[PDB]
Write a protein that binds this ligand. Structure first.
Ligand SMILES: N[C@@H](Cc1c[nH]c2ccccc12)C(=O)O
Ligand SMILES: [Mg+2]
Ligand SMILES: [Mg+2]
Ligand SMILES: [Mg+2]
Ligand SMILES: [Mg+2]
Ligand SMILES: [Mg+2]
Ligand SMILES: [Mg+2]
Ligand SMILES: [Mg+2]
Ligand SMILES: [Mg+2]
Ligand SMILES: [Mg+2]
Ligand SMILES: [Mg+2]
Ligand SMILES: [Mg+2]
Ligand SMILES: [Mg+2]
Ligand SMILES: [Mg+2]
Ligand SMILES: [Mg+2]
Ligand SMILES: [Mg+2]
Ligand SMILES: [Mg+2]
Ligand SMILES: [Mg+2]
Ligand SMILES: [Mg+2]
Ligand SMILES: [Mg+2]
Ligand SMILES: [Mg+2]
Ligand SMILES: [Mg+2]
Ligand SMILES: [Mg+2]
Ligand SMILES: [Mg+2]
Ligand SMILES: [Mg+2]
Ligand SMILES: [Mg+2]
Ligand SMILES: [Mg+2]
Ligand SMILES: [Mg+2]
Ligand SMILES: [Mg+2]
Ligand SMILES: [Mg+2]
Lengths: 56, 150, 48, 110, 16, 142, 103, 117
RNA sequence: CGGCGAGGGGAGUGAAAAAGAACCUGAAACCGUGUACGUACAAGCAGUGGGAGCACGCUUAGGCGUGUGACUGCGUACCUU
RNA sequence: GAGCGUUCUGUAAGCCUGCGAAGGUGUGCUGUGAGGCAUGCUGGAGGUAUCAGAAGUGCGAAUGCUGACAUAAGUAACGAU
């Protein structure tokens, strides 16, 4: 079925009220390399909890 | 309008407002509804009304003193400079000069001054007589005008 | 007596009807033809 | 001193890019770069490129320091839309608006 | 053109 | 000059205490509704609450004339199908009498946010005690 | 003090030194106007109520301004009956300055 | 002579929309809905000039009634007393006094009671 | 800056880039960003009559003007037929 | 019955105008109305008094025509399990 009346910009905003993203609360610093990373994720260089887990 | 007489879409079932020709005056690039044609804009004036209008115009010109009567009005040679000097001598700028006989030298002299016109006796008209600021009558022109107006 | 000091006589130049140009003119919408019928149809009417 | 970087006719829709822009509006530039690094959106990639360009503008052209910069303004406007055809069932054609957007980032210290 | 449920006869002639 | 109107941050509201023992329900309720609306003040303004706070003691001892103690039926609907409920006056007194007084005054008050504010001003007690001795109510004879 | 009088079919309660807007009086721009029909004069618990006019009490005003009031639009509209009409209106007024109340 | 209608059309539509400034949504944006609102606003304004006169008389009656009942007489008997004592102070001024000068209204109530008695 | 991009910011020409090639002017619908006010116990052609408070300008320090509009009386769109 | 406005012709090789025209967007004044007048900002070269004259002369509706842009909606779907 299909609408009888055109919804407004007000109701469009009210429906999109819950569409907002949530940023990550805080990043992490590694105790060896010192690089910010997602928690429980290995860093960009390949460190995790102070151990080089992957080469390069 | 250039186009065909085909119905643009079938009468019923399309869901669109019905149309019967692409050349409809409603449509974009359609024809004009009441398109104008070459027509004759001229009006008839009775001869006695035309003569009464000229008599009233001449009487009003004499009443407001815009009509100067001179005995003779001519130039020696067709020189616009000479005519302009003679009119500045007479202290006239915007002038219709009627002359009893069509003079080639005067006509060629006044052809280039756009505020000065030179007319023969038989060719005066209400728009020119009303529009031009001063009108200069020669005596022969006065006689011819009074004769043709009776 | 100039070209912009001449005016016609009083009552000699009454302006024509302009049919269908809004409510206030008194000739809007139907334009003096009533409602429906052969006499309000375009080109309608009977012969003499 | 406000410094402006724009990316025009960005091949993305204004609504999604508005989600990301409203995510970073008002933060410091370092926090904003962390947020745009770890947001999983194509609009986040586009907005991060514009923001890094704005920071480099504020360095090179006006001498502003990174540690003082904040994202004063950010807004996404609707750009022109390319119109395409998607053929449907039973001979019907439907039109597809491949939307674009203009992403503007204004960074400053005050 | 036209919808098949408008061309159909059992549902168009629903209230004769 | 423009007609004076009461201002909601300037008006003074008093506190009264009214014994409902032996009064007639309707006439007591009309006088309460008038004093909650504030029709008794020269500074009355229709869009401004200007009434007085009224405490009603012994709400379980009101009187109704005729057979109204047994025949006056209160109806309501629970919003579910078949959910029409009724309760007579004596059942309403036996269960909760403050609601008898409160429906009478609520039906006599205007409808809307302002009438809701005036009904907020009305305080009804079933016994002959109140907690509002700190506000120092004056005895009102109705 | 204040005094209740009538002018232009309406009644006004005025004090000394006030500016009062009345209906258009046929008095020139800067003259004085003498109101004799005073309904009531109050003088701080000294009240005089006329039956119908207070005897010997008059109000003296100085005409300050003449003018036209703020415009209003009159709209008349009969729907589906093809009837619509509009009009404008500005009401003339006279500002006086009440400068004397004498009992 | 062909006439193009852009300038006049824009002027008329903008006149209506400037009148319809302040309304909700399409009533202040869209010309059609705005025109339907401005006409209704004019009709309501006319009808409410009349209703303003009625409403203000109603308010004055209520205030005179409250003050007279405070002074120990009903509104109807108070007005009967004034019309019998031939006092021509109208209801606007009487409500004004009833709010601002209670002593003068006490004097008026005493006059009306003396006229009835 | 960017992918030896797209796009942009400086510099420069020009009277003007509030004429940069998607280029004279640049309306409305439509979509945003900032500021002021209102709005999370409140029912309906969404206005109108009354109306407090708040914010900003004030030039008789007097109230006025502008924006909002809590509360409130009345109030079921336009065309056609 | 009486009028407002718009385009064009005459008055007009006149009058206003790069010390800023038309157009666009605000503000203030004014008329009983259609409307007029003044001015800030954008604009960047035309406009036109007054009295007459001619009409492709005034739009909200026609399941009206053409372009642009919303809505359902960041929803269904993304074409062989
Ligand atoms: N509905 C079926 C059959 C169908 C096709 N065309 C029709 C026209 C009228 C009625 C039914 C049909 C289909 O789409 O294939
Ligand atoms: Mg319907
Ligand atoms: Mg054509
Ligand atoms: Mg002939
Ligand atoms: Mg008629
Ligand atoms: Mg019929
Ligand atoms: Mg019809
Ligand atoms: Mg007929
Ligand atoms: Mg035909
Ligand atoms: Mg096919
Ligand atoms: Mg009611
Ligand atoms: Mg043209
Ligand atoms: Mg707007
Ligand atoms: Mg480049
Ligand atoms: Mg140019
Ligand atoms: Mg442009
Ligand atoms: Mg715009
Ligand atoms: Mg409740
Ligand atoms: Mg609330
Ligand atoms: Mg609701
Ligand atoms: Mg109602
Ligand atoms: Mg032009
Ligand atoms: Mg011209
Ligand atoms: Mg036309
Ligand atoms: Mg239109
Ligand atoms: Mg219509
Ligand atoms: Mg859905
Ligand atoms: Mg779903
Ligand atoms: Mg899916
Ligand atoms: Mg596939």
């Amino acid at each position: 079925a299909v609408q009888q009346n055109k919804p407004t910009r007000s109701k469009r905003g009210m429906r999109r009220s819950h569409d907002a993203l949530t940023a990550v609360t805080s990043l992490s610093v590694d105790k060896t390399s010192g690089e910010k990373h997602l928690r429980h994720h290995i860093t960009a260089d390949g460190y995790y909890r102070g151990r080089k887990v992957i080469a390069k | 309008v250039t186009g065909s007489g085909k119905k643009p879409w079938r009468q019923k079932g399309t869901g669109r407002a019905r149309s019967g020709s692409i050349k409809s005056p409603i449509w974009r690039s359609g024809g004009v509804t009441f398109a104008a044609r070459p027509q004759d804009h001229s009006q008839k004036v009775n001869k006695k009304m035309y003569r009464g209008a000229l008599k009233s115009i001449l009487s009003e010109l004499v009443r407001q003193d815009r009509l100067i009567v001179v005995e003779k009005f001519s130039v020696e040679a067709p020189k616009t400079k000479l005519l302009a000097q003679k009119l500045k001598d007479m202290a006239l700028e915007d002038v219709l000069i009627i002359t009893g006989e069509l003079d080639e030298n005067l006509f060629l002299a006044a052809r280039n001054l756009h505020k000065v016109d030179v007319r023969d006796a038989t060719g005066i008209d209400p728009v020119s007589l009303i529009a031009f600021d001063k009108v200069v009558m020669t005596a022969d022109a006065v006689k011819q005008v009074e004769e043709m107006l009776a | 007596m100039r070209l912009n000091t001449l005016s016609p006589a009083e009552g000699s130049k009454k302006a024509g009807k302009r049919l269908g140009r809004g409510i206030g003119s008194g000739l809007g919408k139907t334009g003096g033809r009533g409602h429906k019928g052969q006499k309000s149809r375009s080109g309608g009417g009977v012969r003499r | 001193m406000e410094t402006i970087a724009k990316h025009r006719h960005a091949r993305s829709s204004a609504q999604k890019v508005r989600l990301v822009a409203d995510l970073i509006r008002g933060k410091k530039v370092s926090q904003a770069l962390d947020i745009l690094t770890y947001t999983n959106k194509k609009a986040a990639v586009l907005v991060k490129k514009v923001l890094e360009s704005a920071i480099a503008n504020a360095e090179h052209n006006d001498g502003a320091d990174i540690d003082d910069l904040k994202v004063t303004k950010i807004f996404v406007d609707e750009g022109p839309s390319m119109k395409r055809i998607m053929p449907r069932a039973k001979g019907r054609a439907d039109r597809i608006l491949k939307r674009t957007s203009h992403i503007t980032v204004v960074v400053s210290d005050r | 053109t036209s919808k098949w449920f408008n061309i159909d006869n059992k549902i168009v002639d629903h209230r004769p | 000059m423009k007609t004076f109107t009461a201002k909601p941050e300037t008006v003074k509201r008093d506190w009264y205490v009214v014994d409902a023992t032996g009064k007639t329900l309707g006439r007591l309720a009309t006088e309460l509704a008038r004093r909650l609306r504030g029709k008794h003040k020269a500074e009355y303004t229709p869009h401004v609450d200007t009434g007085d706070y009224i405490i009603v003691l012994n709400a379980d001892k009101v009187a109704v004339t005729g057979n109204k103690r047994t025949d006056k039926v209160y109806y309501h609907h629970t919003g579910h199908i078949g959910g029409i409920k009724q309760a007579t006056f004596e059942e309403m007194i036996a269960r909760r009498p403050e609601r008898v007084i409160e429906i009478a005054v609520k039906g006599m008050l205007p409808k809307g946010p302002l009438g809701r504010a005036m009904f907020r001003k009305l305080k009804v007690y079933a016994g002959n005690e109140h907690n509002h001795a700190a506000q120092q109510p004056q005895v009102l004879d109705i | 003090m204040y005094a209740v009088f009538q002018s232009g079919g309406k009644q006004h309660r005025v004090s000394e030194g006030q500016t009062v807007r009345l209906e258009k009086l046929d008095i020139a721009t800067g003259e004085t106007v003498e109101f004799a029909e005073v309904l009531m004069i109050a003088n701080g618990e000294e009240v005089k109520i006329g039956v119908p006019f207070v005897d010997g009490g008059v109000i003296k005003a100085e005409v300050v301004a003449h003018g036209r009031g703020e415009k209003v639009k009159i709209v008349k509209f009969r729907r589906r009956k093809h009837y619509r009409k509009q009009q404008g209106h500005r009401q003339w007024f006279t500002d006086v300055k009440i400068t004397g109340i004498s009992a | 002579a062909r006439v193009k209608r852009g300038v006049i059309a824009r002027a008329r539509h903008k006149k209506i929309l400037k009148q319809a400034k302040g309304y909700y949504g399409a009533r202040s944006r869209v010309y059609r809905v705005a025109f339907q609102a401005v006409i209704k606003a004019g009709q309501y304004a006319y009808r409410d000039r009349r209703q303003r006169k009625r409403q203000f008389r109603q308010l004055w009656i209520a205030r005179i009634n409250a003050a007279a009942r405070q002074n120990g007489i009903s509104y109807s008997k108070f007005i009967n007393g004034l019309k019998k004592a031939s006092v021509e102070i109208d209801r606007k001024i009487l409500a004004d006094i009833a709010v601002f000068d209670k002593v003068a209204f006490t004097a008026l109530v005493e006059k009306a009671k003396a006229a009835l008695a």
